[PDB]
Structure formats: structure tokens, C-alpha cells
Short mmCIF file of C-alpha atoms in Angstrom, two decimals:
data_model
loop_
_atom_site.label_atom_id
_atom_site.label_comp_id
_atom_site.label_asym_id
_atom_site.label_seq_id
_atom_site.Cartn_x
_atom_site.Cartn_y
_atom_site.Cartn_z
CA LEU I 2 51.31 153.64 76.76
CA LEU I 3 48.15 154.83 78.25
CA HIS I 4 44.31 152.67 77.43
CA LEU I 5 41.81 154.53 77.50
CA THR I 6 38.70 152.09 77.17
CA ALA I 7 39.87 150.40 80.16
CA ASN I 8 38.90 153.53 82.00
CA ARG I 9 34.58 152.98 80.28
CA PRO I 10 32.10 152.28 83.01
CA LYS I 11 31.51 147.72 82.31
CA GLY I 12 28.47 146.80 79.89
CA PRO I 13 25.06 144.96 81.45
CA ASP F 30 34.82 121.36 73.32
CA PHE F 31 38.40 120.47 75.17
CA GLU F 32 38.83 118.43 71.51
CA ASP F 33 38.46 121.26 70.77
CA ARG F 34 40.60 123.53 72.70
CA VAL F 35 43.88 126.37 71.37
CA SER F 36 46.60 124.03 71.24
CA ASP F 37 49.76 125.39 72.60
CA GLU F 38 51.65 125.05 68.54
CA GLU F 39 48.22 127.86 67.44
CA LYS F 40 49.50 129.53 70.14
CA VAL F 41 52.97 129.87 69.07
CA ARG F 42 52.32 130.56 65.67
CA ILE F 43 49.53 133.33 66.65
CA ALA F 44 52.16 134.45 69.16
CA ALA F 45 54.51 134.39 66.18
CA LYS F 46 52.34 135.72 63.73
CA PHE F 47 51.72 138.85 66.21
CA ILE F 48 55.42 139.46 66.08
CA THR F 49 55.47 139.64 62.05
CA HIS F 50 52.91 142.52 62.18
CA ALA F 51 55.15 144.85 64.28
CA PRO F 52 54.89 148.48 62.79
CA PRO F 53 58.20 149.55 61.78
CA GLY F 54 60.58 150.17 65.61
CA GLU F 55 58.12 148.90 67.74
CA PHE F 56 59.90 144.91 67.39
CA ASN F 57 60.62 144.56 71.22
CA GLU F 58 57.62 146.16 72.64
CA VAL F 59 55.74 143.69 70.48
CA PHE F 60 56.98 140.83 71.71
CA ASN F 61 57.40 141.49 75.38
CA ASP F 62 53.77 141.96 75.56
CA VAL F 63 53.60 138.98 73.15
CA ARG F 64 56.19 137.01 75.78
CA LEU F 65 53.89 137.91 78.88
CA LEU F 66 50.32 136.89 77.09
CA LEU F 67 51.78 133.11 76.16
CA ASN F 68 54.05 133.10 79.59
CA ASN F 69 56.19 130.24 77.52
CA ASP F 70 59.80 131.03 76.86
CA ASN F 71 60.15 128.23 75.85
CA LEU F 72 57.99 127.34 73.91
CA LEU F 73 57.97 131.14 72.17
CA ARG F 74 61.84 130.91 70.96
CA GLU F 75 61.67 127.77 69.93
CA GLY F 76 58.03 128.22 67.79
CA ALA F 77 58.69 131.93 67.21
CA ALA F 78 62.22 131.85 65.26
CA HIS F 79 61.37 131.63 62.43
CA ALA F 80 59.13 134.38 62.83
CA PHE F 81 62.45 137.05 64.17
CA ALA F 82 64.41 136.11 61.12
CA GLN F 83 61.08 136.52 58.76
CA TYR F 84 60.43 140.46 60.36
CA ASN F 85 63.87 141.54 59.90
CA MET F 86 64.04 140.21 56.45
CA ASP F 87 60.96 141.61 55.87
CA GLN F 88 61.44 144.66 56.93
CA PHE F 89 65.17 145.50 55.53
CA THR F 90 66.47 146.08 59.00
CA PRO F 91 69.94 147.83 58.71
CA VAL F 92 72.85 146.94 60.94
CA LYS F 93 76.30 148.18 62.08
CA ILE F 94 78.91 145.51 61.44
CA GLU F 95 81.85 146.78 63.11
CA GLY F 96 85.25 147.88 61.84
CA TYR F 97 82.62 148.04 58.43
CA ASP F 98 81.50 151.66 57.76
CA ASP F 99 78.84 151.17 55.81
CA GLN F 100 75.32 149.64 57.58
CA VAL F 101 73.79 146.62 55.64
CA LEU F 102 70.18 144.94 55.26
CA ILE F 103 68.91 141.84 56.24
CA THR F 104 66.94 140.94 53.54
CA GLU F 105 66.24 137.52 52.06
CA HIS F 106 68.43 137.87 49.60
CA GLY F 107 71.62 137.70 52.02
CA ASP F 108 69.96 134.71 53.99
CA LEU F 109 73.22 132.45 54.50
CA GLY F 110 71.86 130.28 56.58
CA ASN F 111 72.73 128.59 60.53
CA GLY F 112 71.84 132.14 61.14
CA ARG F 113 74.74 134.71 58.90
CA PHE F 114 73.81 137.04 56.41
CA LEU F 115 75.72 138.50 53.32
CA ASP F 116 77.47 141.88 53.14
CA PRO F 117 78.00 142.16 49.21
CA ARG F 118 79.55 145.39 49.75
CA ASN F 119 81.74 143.89 52.46
CA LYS F 120 82.49 140.53 51.48
CA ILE F 121 81.94 139.15 54.12
CA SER F 122 78.94 137.29 56.00
CA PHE F 123 78.55 137.62 59.82
CA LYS F 124 76.82 136.42 62.37
CA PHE F 125 72.97 138.20 63.06
CA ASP F 126 71.03 137.50 66.41
CA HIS F 127 67.16 138.77 65.35
CA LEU F 128 66.44 139.27 68.75
CA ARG F 129 68.92 141.69 70.01
CA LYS F 130 69.36 142.99 66.03
CA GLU F 131 73.36 142.42 67.14
CA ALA F 132 76.25 141.44 63.78
CA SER F 133 79.05 139.40 64.83
CA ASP F 134 82.13 137.00 63.55
CA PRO F 135 82.94 138.95 60.44
CA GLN F 136 84.57 136.59 58.15
CA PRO F 137 85.53 137.33 54.28
CA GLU F 138 82.40 135.01 51.44
CA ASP F 139 83.47 133.76 48.22
CA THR F 140 82.26 135.84 45.72
CA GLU F 141 82.13 134.89 42.43
CA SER F 142 84.79 136.87 39.45
CA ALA F 143 82.28 137.47 37.42
CA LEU F 144 79.24 139.85 38.24
CA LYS F 145 82.01 141.86 40.58
CA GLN F 146 82.24 144.45 38.09
CA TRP F 147 78.92 144.91 37.59
CA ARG F 148 77.40 144.47 41.18
CA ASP F 149 79.78 146.34 42.29
CA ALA F 150 78.96 150.01 39.26
CA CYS F 151 75.03 149.23 40.59
CA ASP F 152 76.46 149.84 44.60
CA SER F 153 78.41 152.71 43.89
CA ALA F 154 75.52 154.58 41.88
CA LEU F 155 73.27 152.99 44.27
CA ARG F 156 74.52 154.45 47.13
CA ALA F 157 75.08 158.03 45.33
CA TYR F 158 71.26 157.98 44.46
CA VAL F 159 71.22 156.85 48.43
CA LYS F 160 72.64 159.48 50.15
CA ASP F 161 70.86 162.62 47.55
CA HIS F 162 67.34 161.20 48.36
CA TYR F 163 67.48 159.63 51.37
CA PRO F 164 68.20 161.35 55.13
CA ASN F 165 68.94 158.19 56.22
CA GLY F 166 68.47 155.47 54.33
CA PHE F 167 71.03 152.98 53.70
CA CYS F 168 71.28 149.67 50.28
CA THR F 169 72.51 147.05 49.56
CA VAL F 170 72.81 145.49 46.35
CA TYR F 171 73.09 141.72 45.74
CA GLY F 172 74.15 140.01 41.79
CA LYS F 173 73.55 136.56 41.60
CA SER F 174 71.85 133.92 39.07
CA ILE F 175 68.70 133.37 39.10
CA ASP F 176 68.28 130.55 37.07
CA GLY F 177 70.30 131.14 33.79
CA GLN F 178 69.28 135.21 34.22
CA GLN F 179 72.48 137.44 35.58
CA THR F 180 70.52 139.29 38.31
CA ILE F 181 70.83 142.39 40.34
CA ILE F 182 68.75 142.87 43.42
CA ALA F 183 69.23 146.77 44.78
CA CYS F 184 67.11 147.53 48.55
CA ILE F 185 67.05 150.49 49.79
CA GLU F 186 65.43 150.68 52.93
CA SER F 187 64.84 154.12 55.50
CA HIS F 188 63.31 154.57 58.81
CA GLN F 189 62.02 157.37 60.94
CA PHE F 190 61.39 156.46 64.80
CA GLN F 191 60.33 158.75 66.95
CA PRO F 192 58.05 156.86 69.87
CA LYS F 193 58.79 159.66 72.53
CA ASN F 194 55.62 161.30 70.03
CA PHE F 195 54.56 157.99 69.54
CA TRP F 196 55.01 157.36 66.17
CA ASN F 197 57.34 155.73 63.61
CA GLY F 198 57.67 155.37 59.43
CA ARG F 199 59.91 153.62 56.82
CA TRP F 200 59.91 153.23 53.39
CA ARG F 201 61.27 150.18 51.84
CA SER F 202 62.16 149.12 48.24
CA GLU F 203 63.46 146.13 46.36
CA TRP F 204 64.66 146.05 42.36
CA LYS F 205 65.21 143.49 40.48
CA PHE F 206 67.16 143.71 37.01
CA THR F 207 67.29 140.35 35.38
CA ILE F 208 69.74 140.99 32.44
CA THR F 209 68.29 139.62 29.31
CA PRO F 210 70.70 141.93 26.24
CA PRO F 211 70.24 144.21 24.99
CA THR F 212 66.96 144.82 27.76
CA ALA F 213 66.43 143.81 31.02
CA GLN F 214 63.14 144.04 32.51
CA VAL F 215 63.02 145.83 35.36
CA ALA F 216 60.36 144.24 38.34
CA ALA F 217 60.69 146.68 41.32
CA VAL F 218 57.75 146.82 44.84
CA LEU F 219 57.41 149.74 46.60
CA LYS F 220 56.12 149.86 50.76
CA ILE F 221 55.41 152.60 53.22
CA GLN F 222 54.05 152.36 56.09
CA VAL F 223 53.47 154.90 59.26
CA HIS F 224 52.18 154.11 62.59
CA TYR F 225 51.22 156.67 64.77
CA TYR F 226 50.03 156.05 68.03
CA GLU F 227 49.20 158.92 70.58
CA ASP F 228 45.62 158.14 72.23
CA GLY F 229 45.19 155.58 69.12
CA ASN F 230 45.71 153.26 66.26
CA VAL F 231 46.44 155.22 62.72
CA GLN F 232 48.81 153.15 60.47
CA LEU F 233 48.89 153.77 56.65
CA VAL F 234 50.25 150.71 54.89
CA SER F 235 51.00 151.18 50.56
CA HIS F 236 52.29 149.78 47.80
CA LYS F 237 53.25 149.89 44.71
CA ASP F 238 54.47 147.36 42.26
CA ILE F 239 56.76 148.37 38.75
CA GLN F 240 57.67 146.88 35.63
CA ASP F 241 59.60 148.39 32.53
CA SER F 242 62.18 147.93 30.80
CA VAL F 243 66.25 149.31 30.35
CA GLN F 244 67.84 148.78 27.42
CA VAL F 245 72.07 147.80 29.07
CA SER F 246 75.82 148.35 27.38
CA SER F 247 78.43 148.96 29.71
CA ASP F 248 78.21 148.22 33.41
CA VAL F 249 78.36 151.19 34.50
CA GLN F 250 76.26 153.09 31.84
CA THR F 251 73.49 151.03 32.62
CA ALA F 252 73.73 151.58 36.02
CA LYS F 253 72.73 155.19 35.28
CA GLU F 254 70.07 153.88 33.66
CA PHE F 255 68.65 151.79 36.25
CA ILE F 256 69.34 154.33 38.98
CA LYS F 257 66.97 156.80 36.56
CA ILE F 258 64.85 155.07 36.42
CA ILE F 259 64.64 153.96 40.03
CA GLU F 260 64.18 158.29 41.15
CA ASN F 261 62.55 158.15 38.40
CA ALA F 262 59.68 155.95 40.15
CA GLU F 263 60.17 156.63 43.55
CA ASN F 264 59.72 160.13 43.11
CA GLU F 265 56.72 159.61 40.55
CA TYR F 266 55.41 157.42 43.57
CA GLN F 267 55.80 159.83 45.94
CA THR F 268 54.11 162.38 44.48
CA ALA F 269 51.81 160.66 43.93
CA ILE F 270 51.12 159.28 47.37
CA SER F 271 50.89 163.09 48.28
CA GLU F 272 48.28 164.12 45.51
CA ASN F 273 46.29 160.81 46.86
CA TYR F 274 46.47 162.54 51.15
CA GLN F 275 44.58 165.69 49.26
CA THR F 276 42.02 164.06 47.11
CA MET F 277 41.32 162.32 50.16
CA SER F 278 41.21 165.21 52.86
CA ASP F 279 39.35 167.01 50.64
CA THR F 280 36.91 164.07 48.70
CA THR F 281 36.19 161.27 51.02
CA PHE F 282 36.63 162.98 54.04
CA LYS F 283 34.00 165.58 53.84
CA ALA F 284 31.35 163.74 52.32
CA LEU F 285 31.75 161.28 55.67
CA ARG F 286 30.07 164.12 57.90
CA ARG F 287 30.14 167.52 57.92
CA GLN F 288 32.17 170.12 60.07
CA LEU F 289 28.64 171.61 61.21
CA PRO F 290 24.40 171.51 60.50
CA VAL F 291 23.97 173.60 57.46
CA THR F 292 22.46 175.95 59.85
CA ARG F 293 26.80 177.25 60.33
CA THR F 294 25.53 176.50 64.08
CA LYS F 295 25.72 173.90 66.79
CA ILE F 296 22.44 172.20 68.09
CA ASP F 297 19.61 173.36 69.62
CA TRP F 298 19.09 169.92 72.26
CA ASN F 299 15.38 171.34 73.30
CA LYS F 300 15.13 171.92 69.64
CA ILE F 301 15.63 168.23 68.62
CA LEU F 302 14.07 166.91 71.75
CA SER F 303 11.17 169.39 70.29
CA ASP V 24 49.67 140.14 86.56
CA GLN V 25 50.44 142.10 82.71
CA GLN V 26 48.35 140.45 80.38
CA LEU V 27 45.24 142.58 79.71
CA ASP V 28 47.58 145.37 80.28
CA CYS V 29 50.00 143.85 77.33
CA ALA V 30 47.05 142.54 75.24
CA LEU V 31 45.12 146.50 74.55
CA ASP V 32 49.29 146.83 73.97
CA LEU V 33 48.88 145.05 71.06
CA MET V 34 45.77 146.60 69.43
CA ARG V 35 47.70 149.55 69.66
CA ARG V 36 50.13 148.22 67.69
CA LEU V 37 49.10 145.67 65.12
CA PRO V 38 47.41 146.70 62.38
CA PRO V 39 43.76 148.35 62.52
CA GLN V 40 43.29 147.45 58.97
CA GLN V 41 42.70 143.62 60.97
CA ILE V 42 41.53 144.61 64.25
CA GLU V 43 38.55 141.95 64.13
CA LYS V 44 41.42 139.53 62.80
CA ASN V 45 44.01 140.12 65.47
CA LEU V 46 41.25 140.20 68.39
CA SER V 47 40.43 137.21 67.50
CA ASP V 48 43.63 135.22 67.56
CA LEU V 49 44.06 137.53 70.91
CA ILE V 50 41.70 135.75 72.64
CA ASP V 51 42.74 132.54 71.47
CA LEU V 52 46.11 133.29 72.75
CA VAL V 53 44.57 134.07 76.44
CA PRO V 54 41.23 132.05 76.46
CA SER V 55 41.45 134.04 79.94
CA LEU V 56 40.72 137.73 79.08
CA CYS V 57 38.01 137.64 76.44
CA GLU V 58 34.91 139.09 78.43
CA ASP V 59 38.02 142.03 79.19
CA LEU V 60 39.33 142.39 76.12
CA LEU V 61 34.88 141.75 74.34
CA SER V 62 34.65 145.36 76.14
CA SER V 63 37.38 147.03 75.80
CA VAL V 64 39.14 146.59 72.38
CA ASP V 65 36.68 149.04 70.36
CA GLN V 66 35.64 146.76 66.46
CA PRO V 67 34.47 147.76 64.03
CA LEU V 68 30.69 148.59 64.28
CA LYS V 69 28.68 145.93 61.97
CA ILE V 70 24.87 146.74 60.97
CA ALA V 71 22.22 144.18 61.60
CA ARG V 72 18.71 144.55 61.02
CA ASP V 73 15.01 144.93 62.78
CA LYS V 74 12.82 143.28 60.58
CA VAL V 75 10.21 143.73 63.51
CA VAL V 76 10.00 147.31 62.44
CA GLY V 77 12.03 147.33 59.51
CA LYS V 78 15.24 149.43 60.68
CA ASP V 79 19.09 149.11 60.54
CA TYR V 80 20.96 148.92 64.67
CA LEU V 81 24.42 148.50 64.62
CA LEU V 82 25.69 145.55 67.12
CA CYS V 83 28.62 145.95 69.18
CA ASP V 84 29.67 144.15 72.74
CA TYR V 85 27.17 146.42 74.68
CA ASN V 86 24.19 145.26 73.35
CA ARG V 87 25.14 141.76 73.16
CA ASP V 88 23.97 138.86 75.09
CA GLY V 89 25.15 136.27 74.24
CA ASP V 90 25.28 135.06 70.76
CA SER V 91 22.47 137.33 70.33
CA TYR V 92 22.03 141.76 69.75
CA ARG V 93 19.16 143.99 71.26
CA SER V 94 17.86 146.44 68.82
CA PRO V 95 17.09 150.24 70.23
CA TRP V 96 14.36 149.90 68.30
CA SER V 97 12.32 147.17 69.55
CA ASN V 98 13.84 146.44 72.41
CA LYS V 99 14.00 142.25 71.19
CA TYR V 100 16.80 139.86 71.10
CA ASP V 101 18.15 137.97 67.59
CA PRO V 102 17.96 135.59 68.23
CA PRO V 103 15.54 135.20 70.49
CA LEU V 104 16.04 134.76 73.83
CA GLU V 105 14.09 134.51 76.61
CA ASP V 106 15.76 136.56 79.62
CA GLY V 107 18.45 138.39 77.59
CA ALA V 108 19.58 141.89 79.40
CA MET V 109 17.49 145.09 78.87
CA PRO V 110 17.59 148.50 80.42
CA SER V 111 15.16 148.93 83.02
CA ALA V 112 11.10 150.55 82.07
CA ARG V 113 11.77 154.03 83.61
CA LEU V 114 15.69 153.86 81.86
CA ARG V 115 14.20 152.15 78.55
CA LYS V 116 11.71 155.29 78.62
CA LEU V 117 15.40 157.23 78.37
CA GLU V 118 17.12 155.23 75.92
CA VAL V 119 13.90 155.85 73.28
CA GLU V 120 13.99 159.34 73.28
CA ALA V 121 18.27 159.26 72.88
CA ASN V 122 17.33 156.89 69.10
CA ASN V 123 15.56 159.58 68.57
CA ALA V 124 17.80 162.53 68.78
CA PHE V 125 20.48 160.44 68.44
CA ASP V 126 18.60 159.41 64.52
CA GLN V 127 18.39 163.32 64.42
CA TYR V 128 22.49 164.30 65.61
CA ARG V 129 22.86 161.49 62.49
CA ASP V 130 20.71 163.50 60.11
CA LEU V 131 21.87 166.85 60.41
CA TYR V 132 25.44 165.73 60.87
CA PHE V 133 26.35 162.65 58.04
CA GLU V 134 22.73 163.34 56.42
CA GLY V 135 23.17 159.48 56.27
CA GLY V 136 24.24 156.34 57.86
CA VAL V 137 23.23 154.13 61.01
CA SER V 138 23.20 155.25 64.77
CA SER V 139 22.15 153.39 67.62
CA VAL V 140 22.21 154.61 71.66
CA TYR V 141 21.22 151.57 74.01
CA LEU V 142 21.55 151.93 77.63
CA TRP V 143 22.45 150.68 80.69
CA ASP V 144 21.56 151.18 84.93
CA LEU V 145 24.48 152.02 87.50
CA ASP V 146 24.10 151.30 90.73
CA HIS V 147 23.31 155.42 91.35
CA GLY V 148 23.04 156.48 87.88
CA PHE V 149 23.62 154.35 84.55
CA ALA V 150 25.68 154.82 81.50
CA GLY V 151 25.20 154.05 77.27
CA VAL V 152 27.15 154.24 74.12
CA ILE V 153 25.85 155.82 71.32
CA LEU V 154 27.45 154.67 68.07
CA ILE V 155 26.96 155.85 64.52
CA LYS V 156 28.11 154.44 61.27
CA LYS V 157 28.50 155.76 57.92
CA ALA V 158 30.03 154.40 54.57
CA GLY V 159 31.19 157.04 51.80
CA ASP V 160 30.21 156.56 48.06
CA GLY V 161 32.96 155.42 46.95
CA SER V 162 33.52 159.06 44.56
CA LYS V 163 36.81 159.51 42.55
CA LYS V 164 37.69 155.46 43.21
CA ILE V 165 37.40 155.25 47.12
CA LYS V 166 35.97 153.53 49.63
CA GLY V 167 35.46 155.62 53.12
CA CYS V 168 33.91 154.56 56.84
CA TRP V 169 33.26 156.37 59.47
CA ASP V 170 32.36 154.29 63.47
CA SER V 171 31.51 156.78 66.37
CA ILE V 172 31.65 154.60 69.89
CA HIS V 173 30.77 157.12 72.21
CA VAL V 174 30.72 155.66 75.82
CA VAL V 175 28.80 158.16 78.34
CA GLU V 176 28.63 157.58 82.10
CA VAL V 177 25.95 158.81 84.34
CA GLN V 178 26.35 158.71 88.09
CA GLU V 179 22.90 160.65 90.01
CA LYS V 180 22.99 162.46 93.67
CA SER V 181 20.22 162.40 95.85
CA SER V 182 19.22 166.39 95.06
CA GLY V 183 19.02 165.51 91.23
CA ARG V 184 20.20 168.83 90.72
CA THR V 185 24.15 168.12 89.67
CA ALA V 186 25.09 165.45 88.25
CA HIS V 187 28.88 164.22 86.97
CA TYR V 188 29.28 162.83 82.82
CA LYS V 189 32.28 161.27 81.98
CA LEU V 190 32.79 160.41 78.55
CA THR V 191 35.33 158.28 76.17
CA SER V 192 34.67 159.10 72.50
CA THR V 193 36.57 156.77 69.94
CA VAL V 194 36.30 157.35 65.85
CA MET V 195 37.87 154.35 63.76
CA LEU V 196 38.20 156.19 60.09
CA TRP V 197 38.95 154.07 56.75
CA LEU V 198 39.84 154.89 53.71
CA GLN V 199 41.77 153.10 50.86
CA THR V 200 42.74 153.51 47.43
CA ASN V 201 44.33 151.66 44.10
CA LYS V 202 45.57 153.60 41.86
CA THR V 203 48.39 153.84 39.63
CA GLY V 204 50.33 156.55 40.35
CA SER V 205 50.27 156.63 44.37
CA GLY V 206 49.24 152.16 44.11
CA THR V 207 47.59 150.20 47.22
CA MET V 208 46.72 152.93 49.96
CA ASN V 209 45.37 151.64 53.01
CA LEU V 210 45.40 154.44 55.67
CA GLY V 211 42.72 153.46 58.72
CA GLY V 212 42.42 153.57 62.44
CA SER V 213 41.08 155.45 64.93
CA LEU V 214 41.52 157.43 67.61
CA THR V 215 40.16 158.39 71.52
CA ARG V 216 39.44 161.23 73.46
CA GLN V 217 38.08 161.84 77.29
CA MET V 218 36.68 163.92 78.65
CA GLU V 219 34.21 164.07 81.78
CA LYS V 220 32.87 167.27 84.06
CA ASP V 221 29.43 168.13 86.60
CA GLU V 222 26.67 169.54 84.55
CA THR V 223 23.51 171.34 85.66
CA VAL V 224 21.01 168.28 85.35
CA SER V 225 17.46 170.62 85.11
CA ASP V 226 13.46 170.57 83.23
CA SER V 227 15.80 172.40 80.99
CA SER V 228 18.91 171.16 80.68
CA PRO V 229 18.08 166.75 81.12
CA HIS V 230 19.91 164.31 80.20
CA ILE V 231 19.59 163.76 76.92
CA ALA V 232 20.46 167.18 76.43
CA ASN V 233 23.73 167.46 78.93
CA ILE V 234 24.78 163.57 77.00
CA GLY V 235 24.22 165.23 73.22
CA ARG V 236 26.49 168.18 73.88
CA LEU V 237 28.92 165.94 74.87
CA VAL V 238 29.12 164.52 71.63
CA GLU V 239 29.02 166.97 69.75
CA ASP V 240 31.57 168.48 71.28
CA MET V 241 33.92 165.99 71.71
CA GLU V 242 33.19 164.74 67.75
CA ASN V 243 33.50 168.00 66.79
CA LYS V 244 36.65 168.36 68.47
CA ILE V 245 37.89 164.30 67.56
CA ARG V 246 36.77 165.19 63.07
CA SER V 247 39.38 168.12 63.54
CA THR V 248 41.99 165.61 65.10
CA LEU V 249 41.58 163.12 62.17
CA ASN V 250 42.04 165.40 60.20
CA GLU V 251 44.69 166.68 61.02
CA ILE V 252 46.46 163.19 62.36
CA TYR V 253 45.53 161.69 58.97
CA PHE V 254 45.99 164.24 56.49
CA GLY V 255 49.08 166.06 58.08
CA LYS V 256 50.64 164.56 60.22
CA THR V 257 50.97 160.94 58.67
CA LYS V 258 51.48 163.18 55.85
CA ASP V 259 54.84 164.33 57.04
CA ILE V 260 56.28 161.38 58.15
CA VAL V 261 55.89 160.12 54.47
CA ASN V 262 57.74 163.15 53.86
CA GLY V 263 60.51 162.71 55.84
CA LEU V 264 61.28 159.52 55.21
CA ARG V 265 62.24 160.42 51.94
#
């Protein structure tokens, strides 16, 4: 499965 | 802190827990995930063997036995121990590999001559009921004695797996008729699970408990009355689920967020800053 | 090493009714993935109270530092932290403006609920999360809740005339009823969508305006896809079982 939230920017 | 570390016993308990919560039709994917996360096949094989069997019995997994036309449900009511299960329609035991979902080594199994007719008559009525009411459903009917009461237990399964479209669903229902002439107590639980996972994870979990009664008489006539009660409750359950969907749609969901602001147009983001 | 891939795959399959419990179980299962899982696994939003300003704010991993959380109103951590992560001074000013803008957006679309926005500096721009939570009133014996999580990444150019925006948006929708006809019925989970585009950045089209349009367009879209998936697709699947 493709994980869209894994290509988000990392937090502070 | 090190004294509070997660033990291997706790890791495989968690592994086993995830496995029993796999959605219908996705056991293999959840198993493969858990196997790679635990990274200890020996520990997995030992500490999660009970969970593989529990998944299949919980899920009423239907299995084809080589040499017999009808599929049989894997349920707790059929667990004969030592990895074997009862097929009460074909009066046989068989070995079941819970990982590969494969039946093997069918052998004749002893059956009390008493409940033969009553179990056969309920099975015959239920089979026609299930073929009429489900697209690809399967059922298994056990006849046992729990305490002093001669009990009929009817299990129905129906699933549709479409993983290339990112969804699976399963219906299960389990009906118990405890015979206490001239009546019988009817207890049942109906279950639905649906999983949609294209760019998301949405799941329906539903169950309904049934309590009814029925006058009992001949084996053939009581089986007809049993199936009439099943049909009525299952039709009613399925209708109410669809009415409830409609209510959720136009009441709760509509109230959570509007489609547009009262202006009937999208926001002017320069006026918002003002 | 596919453990993180397998962990995310697992969270796509285990019942979303137990998201919080399964994430903590999953971190117990593989502690080395904790930081990656906390940043990539969306969880239901929790509400906290900014006692200084008397306002509610929303808790997620992006405004967390250790065991404390940063309020978007006061810019302070609770429990207090001596050197908690904070946005730069200029970014903080944009963050205040964003919180005001999306507070109005919240009132316009949700007529209630709570919002929070948190920004953080990046090497060549910034990122932020826009959070909205709205619980249903309980009418007709239905419990309902909505969580929005919008994560935007903004890549700025030396020329300052154009910037690249990437939006990853998740809406979690939860509904449950217990009625005599349909028994217990829990319909819950989430959908995620992504998009990106270059936008003009000008005095008449500033960052917050560009982000707000992207978020509004995305959320209107996800609202309609939740309607389709929840009350169309999963219902259709139920009726195909019998």
C-alpha cells in the first residue's frame, strides 16, 4: 500500500 | 527503566493480538507485517499459534475439503483438538492448517444417531435459505448436548473480497436453538465487518444480539419455523442498517460540517485577513 | 529493512476504532520505530486548555516536545518547558495570523468545534499543520466526531515571487449508534489526500491566503469523498454480502 503521510514534512 | 522493558512474551502477545484483529480477507497481509515487525519466526510460531486458530474460528473461515462438494465453516463448535475440525454435514473430521487455510486427511467421525435427523433437517432447511439469501454464502449446523439440553447451532458466513479495489467485507451469523419442549429458546448474534482502504482506512463494525422463542414439534416442521425466524431477523437487521446509514448521512454528517458557508460561495481569503 | 513500511501497512488494516491503542501496542512491539510512527501515524485529536488565555487548543505530535505541548495562543508549553521548540520570531507572527484566519474558517464551515495551527521553520521555507475538531451533538442517538489534519509544506524561492506548496490532508470521521433495529453500528476511520502546486506569492496573494485556499479546496473535496465512501461504498458492500 502507498502511505501518503510518509511523504509529509517532519515536525519541529 | 531496563527493568520495565517490553519482554519477548509481551511482543508476541501483541503480535498475536494484531493477527486476531486482521480484517476479513487480509490475514496474510497482517501476518506478513507482524512477522517482519517481530523478526523472530520461532517466537512467532510458538506464541501466536493460538491466534491463527482463533482468527479462523472467529471469522467462520469456509474451507473446501477435497472429495466433498460443500464447504465447511471453521468454528469453535467444530474444534476437535489436535488441529482437526468437524464437518457435521459430511460426518468427517479433517486436519486444518490455519496458516495456509488448507484442509487435509478427512476421516469418518462418530456421530450420535439421536440428533442425526434434527441436525440433518435444520441443515437442509438452512442450506436452501442461505443459497436463496446470500450470493456466495456457506453454513454449518452442529447438533450437540450442552448440559442436558439438546442444542442446534447454526452458523452462516458470506464474504466478498476485492483487494485490488481496496475493500473486503464479511457477514457472520450464529443461531442457537436450545430445546426445552414445547418451546425452544433462540439466541443469536449477527455480525458485519467492512474494510475500505484506498488512500485511507474506513471500517464498519456492527453486531446485533437476538433473543426469541419458538414452539417445537416435528424435526421437519421445527426446522421450517427456525429458518423463518432467521429470515425475519436477518432481513430486519439488514434493512435497519441501511436506514441507519441514511440517518447518519443526512443528520449527523450534515451537522458536523457545512458544504459551503451561508454565502453559498467559498471564502474570500483576502477579506478573512481584513 | 521494511519494518516501518510494514508498521504503516498494519495501521491501514487494524480497526481505526482502536487507533490510539494499536499505535501504543505497535511502539511496544518495535520501539526503534517510535519517532517515525508518532510523526506518520495520525491519531484522533485531543483538546487541551490554555489556562493563561482561557482557550482550547488541539494536541498532536507536531506541537509536542517531550511530554509537553505548545499552545498556539500563548506560545508556551504545558507542562512548562525551559527550552521547548518554538517557531522563529517572524514565523510566529505568521502563525498567530494563521490561527486567527483558520479560527474564522472553522466558524464559517463548522459553526463550532476547535481549531489550532502550528508552524515550524524549514531550511528553504516552512511547514505547518492546521487542525480542526468538531463533535456531533448526539442527535437521533448518534455519536459523531470529525478531525481535520492538514499538513502543508512551503518551499520559498530567492525571488520571492513564487512558492511551492505541498498539502497532505487527513480527515477522520467517526459515527456510532446502538438501536433496536440495527443493533450496534460503528462506522469510523479516515481518508487521506495529497496535492501540490506552485502559486504566486504577492502582497495581494500572501502565504496564508494561498494555504487557506488549498485547505478549503481539499477539505470540501474530502467531505464529498467521505460522503461517497462512508454512506455509499461501505453500504453497497454490506448489501452485496447478503
